Ligand binder design. Structure first.
Ligand SMILES: [Mg+2]
Length: 280
């Protein structure tokens, strides 16, 4: 089974509170309390518990004095993490009297309320085609240079995977291994469609979840890259203007939906300052 943590996103609200996406973490070994360390610093007075199936949650009282199982921590808990802007290292330590201490590592990102995100599907959009693997999937040409320059202009790349949770760590390794003419894929969180995280329209629900951790009065999702018409629908209903949605096919032809224009990652990169203007 899966052992790891799905990249976590945290957003600082303009009242200085903190909101985050749900924590999806699994201890594959453990067949129990859970402590946290952020940036190699243990976090005091914060703990998680674990269900029989291995999924973990923050215990939180409701108004009837019953324990609720939250995947999203309170703002007060998140402030104790002492998160820096951007990437942060996070580890979860599950202590068990039978199996001792078990540790998993992951990534947690802190954005501001005015941070602008650029979504990118993985399969068919980064890879050329949409269980046996080696990471040698083919990659559309010139995509690493394009995304690098989007990031350099102040946007934040956010990747989207609909593969089963078993492949999550593989997808992370595939993206960080891409090298094209010296360019690499900019570091960023990989969100997992909630249908793949079973416990107790999916791409659209995930992106609306991400949008809703930002205040209502800003539109945080600037643009999106996909390869199926359902990717365009997911982005539109999460707040992306049609003009900023790009849909690529297996011949690496990119359609800019708003302008109904045929293009490519190379040509979009040449027009980077027009389509992805630099942010202050
Ligand atoms: Mg796809």
């Amino acid at each position: 089974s899966f052992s790891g943590v799905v990249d976590i996103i945290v957003v600082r609200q303009p009242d200085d509170s903190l909101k985050s996406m749900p924590f999806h973490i699994r201890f594959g070994t453990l067949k129990i309390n859970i402590q946290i360390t952020v940036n190699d610093k243990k976090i005091e007075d914060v703990f998680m518990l674990m269900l029989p199936e291995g999924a973990c949650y923050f215990p939180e009282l409701n108004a009837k004095n019953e324990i609720q199982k939250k995947l999203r921590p309170s703002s007060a808990i998140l402030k104790k993490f002492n998160l820096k802007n951007g990437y942060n290292k996070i580890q979860f330590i599950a202590e068990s009297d039978l199996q001792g201490k078990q540790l998993i590592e992951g990534k947690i990102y802190l954005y501001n309320y005015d941070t602008k995100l650029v979504i990118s599907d993985v399969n068919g959009t980064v890879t050329k085609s949409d269980s046996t693997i080696i990471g040698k999937e083919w990659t559309h040409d010139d995509i690493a240079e394009l995304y690098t320059n989007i990031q350099k202009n102040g946007y934040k790349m956010v990747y989207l995977s609909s593969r089963p949770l078993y492949f999550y760590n593989y997808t992370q390794g595939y993206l960080k291994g891409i090298i094209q003419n010296g360019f690499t894929m900019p570091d960023g969180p990989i969100l997992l469609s909630p249908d793949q995280i079973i416990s107790s329209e999916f791409k659209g629900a995930l992106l609306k979840d991400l949008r809703r951790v930002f205040p209502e009065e800003v539109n945080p999702i600037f643009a999106g890259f996909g390869n199926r018409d359902t990717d365009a629908t997911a982005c539109l209903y999460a707040g992306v203007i049609i003009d900023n949605i790009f849909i690529i096919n297996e011949q690496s032809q990119v359609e800019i939906l708003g302008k109904q224009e045929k293009s490519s990652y190379k040509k979009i990169n040449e027009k980077i300052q027009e389509l992805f203007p630099r942010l202050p």
